[PDB]
Predict the structure.
Amino acid sequence: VLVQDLLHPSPATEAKQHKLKTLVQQPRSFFMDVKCQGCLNITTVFSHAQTAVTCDSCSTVLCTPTGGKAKLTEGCSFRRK
Amino acid sequence: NINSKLALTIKSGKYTLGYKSVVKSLRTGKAKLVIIAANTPVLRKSELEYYAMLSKTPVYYFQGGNNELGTVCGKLFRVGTLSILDAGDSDILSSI
Amino acid sequence: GRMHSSGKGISSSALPYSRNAPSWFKLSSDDVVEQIIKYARKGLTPSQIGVILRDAHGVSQAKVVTGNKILRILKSNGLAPEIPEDLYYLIKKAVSVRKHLEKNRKDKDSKFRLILIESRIHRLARYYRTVAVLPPNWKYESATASALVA
Amino acid sequence: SSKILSENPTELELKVAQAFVDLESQADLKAELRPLQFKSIKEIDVNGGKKALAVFVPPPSLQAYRKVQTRLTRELEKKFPDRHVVFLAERRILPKPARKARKQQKRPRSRTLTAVHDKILEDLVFPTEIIGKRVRYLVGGNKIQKVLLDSKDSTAVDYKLDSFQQLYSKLTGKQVVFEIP
Amino acid sequence: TRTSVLADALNAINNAEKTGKRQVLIRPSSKVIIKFLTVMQKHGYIGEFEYIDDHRSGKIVVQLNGRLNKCGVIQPRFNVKINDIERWTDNLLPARQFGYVILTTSAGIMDHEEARRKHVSGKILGFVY
Ligand SMILES: [Mg+2]
Ligand SMILES: [Mg+2]
Ligand SMILES: [Zn+2]
């Protein structure tokens, strides 16, 4: 295809692209609100967290780091901000 | 890991290096932990831990000799034993 | 790419287009600095302070909130380490390899890796000297490296 | 007239400050409108019979205005009908020194003309945030900026934008187009 | 490493025009690249082009109209006296009636005929025809 709108890529194919290969690079990661099951305390956690974040109230691990996105422990619910 | 923990204490907390200062620090009850090098003589060692027994002071047995204990503390000389008087920014006392 | 390899990896962070704080960020530019200094006194270097801040405090970038880079803030409070963090970790790894070499002299691969690590130390240390981050007479000595890091 | 940080304010400047001495009446917003001050009010005519209101503010006081600007713009535009209100800081631009110029102190980047014009274009759309800028270089020789705005708080400005482009044309001489993708 | 962004910029355009594409994305941008394209655009060898802001060096999208035979840089940017321009136009351009050598002179970036009109010379920067 010789003629193409490079300035307006289809947003579907733009999202399958690598994160550095869009027109303007933009991270695909985000920040989350973690509700532990034990208590009710908003704790802001990065989606790709490298730390075993613990909430202030109880010294319980909220998430465990993995190769990519952190894995939330059971009973912890997140909502993306 | 504890070498790193101990290093924070050398930077921020208070300590005395050496047998004569350590026994004095055990006598006044101002010693919080006694660190003994691996190649320390048993006679001097079993006496340091008898002083600590009277003083109710924990003893940590460093695995290296007086040459490696000195360089962990950022010193260019040998340290056969040392006492931590005030653990500062570290949590070494909470990690034995 | 890859100064000391044949790799051509491109993995890195992708900073967002926005240079302003998120609307949901509620902490002040003040509260982050005492948080930053608090962690620096725990012995954390600026890299590990920034990871914990975004990992546990939602601080995406300290610059978009506070206005200054993290190391610039410690240096303004007399908490900047004498040796910069990346150079410290290069020297510390080189110290570790040589201690392993002294017990395993036939590990000819580790001798090769050590030459790469130390060459990386001298090139970066030469840079820190031209910009007066290190004294002009600062020189890396293999014998005394363990004092600086241990 | 104490609100105005300028000598001999015009009658329009007095009326705006006269509005400023009336919105603290409701105490929900009174504890902070006293320290707020401004230097000048430049006003131009946009098409459609409306008139553009540019409030010029000392740069250190801008972050104080932003705490109530969302509210403050809607009520001052009601008090003054058919008026489009924006708040800009009167940043100072230092000209680029010539080759044989006498040496002065190093010009910080915030005082450069590109940075200041990028700034007034951002103060122009305050409730919204900029998500992208593009510049077309047309075959005729002229150049047009394009600014893409976020849909959040779009309702505060989405009915204007045309006022912003002509007002920006007044300050810089350049053409701009605001778009909400 | 990346030593000349203008050489990289023209190479992407050069390869797309040869393959018949009518548009090209350029990364990264710069002042010299933008002004090099304006000279080509002023003489009609390219169409409208677009600058994309990424809070970085920048990006460009160029519309090609198929009229461009070749555009290129000259590395290094040799110093050219006014009497040496003729030798350069002879070596680089297909004829005496068309084509342009782009120079960067203290009077600005310009083609060799505009440079002759205003009687200035600088360093050679590239060519287009
Ligand atoms: Mg690469
Ligand atoms: Mg090499
Ligand atoms: Zn919890």
About this structure: Chain E is about 30% helix and 30% strand. The first helix of chain E runs from residue 5 to 18. The interface with chain D takes residues 34, 37-38, 41-42, 47-53 of chain E (CB under 8 Å).
